[PDB]
Amino acid sequence: TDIHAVLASNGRIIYISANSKLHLGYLQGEMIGSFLKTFLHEEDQFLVESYFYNHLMPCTFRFIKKDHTIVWVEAAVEIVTTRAERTEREIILKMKVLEEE
Amino acid sequence: TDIHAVLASNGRIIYISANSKLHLGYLQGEMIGSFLKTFLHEEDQFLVESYFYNEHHLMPCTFRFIKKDHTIVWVEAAVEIVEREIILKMKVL
Numbered sequence: 182t183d184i185h186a187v188l189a190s191n192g193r194i195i196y197i198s199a200n201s202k203l204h205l206g207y208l209q210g211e212m213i214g215s216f217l218k219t220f221l222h223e224e225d226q227f228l229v230e231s232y233f234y235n236h237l238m239p240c241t242f243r244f245i246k247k248d249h250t251i252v253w254v255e256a257a258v259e260i261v262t263t264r265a266e267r268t269e270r271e272i273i274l275k276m277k278v279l280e281e282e
Numbered sequence: 283t284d285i286h287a288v289l290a291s292n293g294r295i296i297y298i299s300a301n302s303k304l305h306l307g308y309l310q311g312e313m314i315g316s317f318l319k320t321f322l323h324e325e326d327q328f329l330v331e332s333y334f335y336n337e338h339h340l341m342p343c344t345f346r347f348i349k350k351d352h353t354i355v356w357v358e359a360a361v362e363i364v365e366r367e368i369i370l371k372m373k374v375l
């Protein structure tokens with residue numbers, strides 16, 4: 182199964198599915214409430230934030246697992262935009278770890 | 283095509299690149315020293331002030347700028363480099 186997640190527009194993890202533990206080394210409750218950029222090196226922070234400034238491909242970046250080692254993750258992005266009093270945006274992710282062969 | 287701007291922590295425009303004229307209708311000199319709020323659609327003032335006060339970002343801030351000719355242009359802006367000044371890049375959508 183893909184890992185499913187939701188981010189607030191500011192990168193805070195609102196939701197991630199429980200298979201975060203298998204693939205990323207974190208229980209879903211260790212990640213929800215934290216910012217995605219906490220689990221990335223600087224190169225990857227810039228890579229991912231750049232993605233949202235302009236897409237032909239999913240967002241591919243290195244994630245630092247709980248054990249401090251990196252995995253490559255490919256993230257399919259959908260934005261839900263809702264216009265009420267202010268316009269608000271949520272990011273829906275479908276992610277998978279790109280495994281070494 | 284990115285407009286580069288630097289804002290003081292109170293929103294005062296410290297610097298804006300020369301392509302402000304092209305995209306926004308104002309020369310740099312007409313904007314530098316003014317508050318960025320002065321140029322924003324009045325409805326987008328909470329949204330933008332709040333965006334640029336906050337430390338954590340992922341998505342750009344999308345808002346309306348009022349050009350010199352009194353018409354709207356939509357732009358997105360992102361913190362470009364991080365009493366700290368904010369360095370932002372922005373572009374017309």
Ligand SMILES: [Cl-]
Nearest residue numbers: 337338339361
């Ligand atoms: Cl930032």
